[PDB]
């Protein structure tokens, strides 16, 4: 068995010796190798060093070729042999990468064997133009109540997850990946969504714990993890968002739908700033190069919703940006805000108070908006958005309002229930029917008698009663696609029956 | 107007070499100016005191051109190489007199069409090895070509043959071949 | 799961053991007559690549 596999790997790995156009390393240092030779080499062509490291031909000069090393530059010495790969920089793509953890070059790192991909795709492909795109009209279900109602994400949208450190940015992104299991297990392939998680500059232990979480929840079957951790070279962390984007662009161009998370692009900008400063390029704002905007703009513009003449596929991007002391006016976050289609802002102050996810409702924007959410969610979240705005205006009167009007007290009481409604535990994403029912109960006044400290327990028990005793209500909602006034009266009665049965 | 060199040589030292090549090929002194430059370079290597004297930036350029002129009359250099070294000492460019000569040697090697071949073997061999290696290397030649063969010995490649050409290279050696096979063993399953 | 992990652990140590055994056996088995035969094959392969043009 093992001997047969070992024998067929020896026989299958034929050397195929032939003369290759080669170069010679002149000087190596600061992640840049200057190579003498390679007359017929192309710009941005991948090379092979004698130690096995890959590199990208960045600068073509009359006398030398500047090569960006995809690895540690201690493996390259002056006078080494640099061979042309003959191809511009590309990574393996396909459905053979699902369930596999790879580095920025596409090589597996989880030890599960090689990757049997038959296709490769360039990492520097330009984004689709005006014509092949179409409007974003299919929902992206993150499973988060506060996201899917107030900052609704569509398929083909770029939604920024921005905040300070340890505010739940990875928690939102991972729960969005886990939530797609209910759609991937179903037979409806148009709602199926593949996932690509790109870890840039993170800790390798953190990536391993993420892969364990995806494996336990069975979310790894449709997920590709591209890992360029903090121990990896800056060119590897620079390349990894484009490598993962190419793997996600395989699904976009083949009629399927993919979600990609760049966690985080602020660390990729640091890696690119390191490469730019070691190339003597003129620093700008916060020592960043001038093309650090084009670094993220050429990446995120490849996340698009394609027209029916292009297969109808899509790529959805969730870039992550870490701020410093909640400063969204800094250079790098302002660049990504000008690129993406809206941002989800996470507050440190809300995170300290126990509000998780600590989403700032007033500072979270979805430029697509209601155009990419279901009728039932849009009809209810429109009312909740108005009521949260009303609660926000009168929140200043709660500080000293010992005596307050009945209308203002109702607005304060409703806003407290709605704020407690949006709280959600980690690694427990919710189906869209469960989200609609819970938000509908809190927005119609059913929770005005329920204490805010018992809303989460009411959320489990009342949904269980609906899922067991009143399944005909859900069937009517699923058939109609919205909430009828007849169903509104029925939901009023079963809420009154449920609260009376719990206590009287 | 300058005559195009057979190959492109880069740097300021290559600019002087292409200027000297173009001037020598507009006239009929290509072989003459190559002969005295090689003999000058051999004279500088055989007498390191001359090389230290020319490269000394303290000495005035009049002493340099007198020393250059005194050692170039014995070379029977007539017009081009004398003006070439006078131009090198007129500027502060005679510090790399070895650089321009080496660049000029590179131009003239491609003028004759010679292609450098580097063949590395674990142990030296002749007779049967050298006869077939010459014919095998001659098969890469386009018409109007010559072979400059350099043989090397290195026990780090176990055995096999590491043969290189002016821009092409192969690694058909035992050490690299078992290395990728062992890499295939570790990455098998 | 216990039998699968036991099989995987035994497979991994057997793969490691056979790798170092093969490396040591290949390195210790060097003969000059085979080395000359491989040298002749390398020259013939180099001559074949020169013809292939």
């Amino acid at each position: 068995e093992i001997s047969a596999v070992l024998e067929e790997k020896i026989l299958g790995a034929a050397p195929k010796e032939n003369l290759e156009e080669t170069g010679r390393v002149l000087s190596i240092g600061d992640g840049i190798a200057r190579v003498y030779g390679l007359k017929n080499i192309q710009a941005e062509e991948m090379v092979e060093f004698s130690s096995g490291l890959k590199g990208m031909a960045l600068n073509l000069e009359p006398d030398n070729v500047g090569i960006v090393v995809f690895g540690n530059d201690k493996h390259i010495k002056e006078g080494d042999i640099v061979k042309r790969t003959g191809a511009i920089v590309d990574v393996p793509v396909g459905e053979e990468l699902l369930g596999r953890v790879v580095d920025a070059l596409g090589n597996p790192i989880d030890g599960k064997g090689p990757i049997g991909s038959k296709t490769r795709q360039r990492v520097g492909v330009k984004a689709p133009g005006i014509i092949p795109r179409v409007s974003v009209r299919e929902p992206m279900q993150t499973g988060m109540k506060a996201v899917d109602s107030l900052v609704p994400i569509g398929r083909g949208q770029r939604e920024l997850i921005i905040g300070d450190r340890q505010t739940g940015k990875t928690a939102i992104a991972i729960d969005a990946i886990i939530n797609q299991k209910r759609f991937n297990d179903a037979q409806d392939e148009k709602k199926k969504l593949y996932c690509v998680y790109v870890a840039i500059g993170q800790k390798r232990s953190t990536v391993a714990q993420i892969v364990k979480r995806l494996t336990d929840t069975d979310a790894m079957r449709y997920t590709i993890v591209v890992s360029a951790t903090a121990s990896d070279a800056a060119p590897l962390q620079y390349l990894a968002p484009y490598s993962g984007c190419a793997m996600g662009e395989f699904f976009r161009d083949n009629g399927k739908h993919a979600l990609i998370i760049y966690d985080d692009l602020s660390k990729q900008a640091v890696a690119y700033r390191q490469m730019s400063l070691l190339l003597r390029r003129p620093p700008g704002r916060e020592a960043y190069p001038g093309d650090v905007f084009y670094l993220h703009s050429r990446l995120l513009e490849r996340a698009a919703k394609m027209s029916e003449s292009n297969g109808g596929g899509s790529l959805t991007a969730l870039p992550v940006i870490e701020t410093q002391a909640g400063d969204v006016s800094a250079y790098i976050p302002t660049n990504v805000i000008s690129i993406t289609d809206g941002q989800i802002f996470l507050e440190t102050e809300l995170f300290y108070k126990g509000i998780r996810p600590a989403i700032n409702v007033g500072l979270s924007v979805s430029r697509v908006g209601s155009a990419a959410q279901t009728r039932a969610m849009k009809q209810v979240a429109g009312s909740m958005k108005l009521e949260l705005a009303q609660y926000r205006e009168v929140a200043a009167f709660a500080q000293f309002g010992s005596d307050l009007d009945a209308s203002t007290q109702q607005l304060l009481s409703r806003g407290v229930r709605l704020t407690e409604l949006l709280k959600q535990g980690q690694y427990v994403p919710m189906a869209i029917e469960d989200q609609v029912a819970i938000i509908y109960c809190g927005v119609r006044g059913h929770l005005d008698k329920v204490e805010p400290s018992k809303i989460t327990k009411f959320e489990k028990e009342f949904s269980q009663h609906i899922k067991t005793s009143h399944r005909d209500i859900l069937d009517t909602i699923a058939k109609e696609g919205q909430i009828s006034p007849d169903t509104d009266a029925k939901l009023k009665k079963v809420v009154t029956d449920f609260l009376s049965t719990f206590q009287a | 107007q300058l005559v195009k060199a057979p190959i492109q040589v880069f740097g300021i030292e290559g600019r002087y070499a292409t200027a000297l090549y173009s001037a020598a090929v507009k006239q009929k002194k290509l072989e003459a100016v190559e002969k005295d430059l090689v003999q000058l370079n051999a004279s500088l290597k055989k007498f390191p005191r001359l090389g230290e004297l020319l490269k000394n930036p303290t000495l005035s350029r009049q002493l340099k051109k007198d020393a250059i002129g005194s050692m170039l009359k014995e070379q029977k250099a007539v017009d081009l190489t004398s003006n070439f070294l006078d131009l090198l000492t007129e500027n502060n460019r005679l510090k790399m007199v070895d650089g321009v000569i080496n660049a000029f040697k590179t131009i003239m090697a491609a003028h004759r069409g010679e292609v450098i071949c580097e063949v590395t073997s674990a142990k030296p061999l002749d007779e049967a090895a050298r006869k077939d290696l010459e014919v095998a290397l001659k098969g890469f030649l386009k018409p109007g070509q010559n072979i400059k063969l350099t043989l090397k010995t290195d026990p780090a490649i176990i055995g096999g043959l590491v043969v290189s050409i002016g821009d092409r290279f192969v690694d058909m050696s035992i050490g690299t071949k078992i290395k990728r096979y062992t890499a295939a063993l570790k990455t098998a399953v | 799961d216990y039998h699968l992990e036991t099989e995987r652990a035994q497979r991994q140590i057997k793969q490691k053991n056979m790798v170092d055994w093969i490396v040591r056996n290949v390195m210790k088995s060097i003969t000059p007559e085979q080395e000359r035969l491989m040298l002749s094959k390398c020259i013939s392969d180099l001559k074949a690549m020169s013809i292939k043009a």
């Binding site: 001997s3 | 078992i178 | 057997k14 053991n17 056979m18 093969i22 290949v26």
Partner: peptide
């Protein structure tokens, strides 16, 4: 259609390992 002699040597070392391992009752 001549095979690589190193590949043949590697196959012989695999067969030699397999014969010695089966003669050792599966032990290392």
């Amino acid at each position: 259609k001549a095979v690589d002699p190193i590949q043949k040597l590697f196959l012989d070392k695999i067969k030699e390992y397999d014969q010695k391992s089966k003669a050792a009752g599966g032990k290392l």
